[PDB]
């Protein structure tokens, strides 16, 4: 699995927009653990259950874990914005709506294969982007 430079750029922009990377280029420590736990949950429970785990904000004991899903959605939208016009494995009728819950989006569109591939690529890209910047 090779990640392009444009994917890492999208990850950096999404991290900036979702207010994970501060202005002074620093990110909270627990976010890398959040990314790794998301990957493990995807492997262990499935894509939809993992997204439901990481979209639930009722924990209020850890940090704000719902930002990682926003970063994933932003990366996926930016990737879909530049899909080539072949329309075989594109499925980009539009981007994911901002106020939609990503789990509901996955339920509605049964293209779990493509969504799984994009989510895995986006998670790896976000891991690399966080590795670029400094922890606490």
């Amino acid at each position: 699995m090779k990640i392009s430079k444009k994917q890492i750029e999208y990850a950096i922009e999404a991290l900036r927009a979702n207010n994970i990377i501060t202005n002074d280029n620093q990110y909270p420590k627990v976010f890398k653990g959040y990314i790794s736990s998301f990957g493990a949950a995807v492997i262990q429970s499935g894509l939809i259950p993992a997204i439901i785990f990481f979209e639930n904000e009722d924990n209020d004991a850890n940090a704000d874990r719902h930002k990682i899903i926003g970063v994933l959605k932003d990366i996926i939208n930016a990737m879909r914005q530049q899909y080539t016009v072949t329309d075989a494995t594109i499925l980009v009728s539009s981007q994911i709506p901002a106020n939609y819950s990503m789990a509901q989006y996955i339920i509605e569109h049964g293209n779990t294969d493509q969504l799984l591939k994009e989510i895995t690529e986006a998670a790896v890209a976000m891991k690399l982007a966080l590795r670029m910047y400094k922890s606490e």
Binding site: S37, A40, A41, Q44, S45, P49, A50, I52, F53, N56, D58, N59
Partner: peptide, 11 residues
């Protein structure tokens, strides 16, 4: 109880 940190929570 073991593996309590493994994510199994949907709310």
């Amino acid at each position: 109880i073991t593996g309590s940190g493994l994510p199994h929570q949907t709310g």
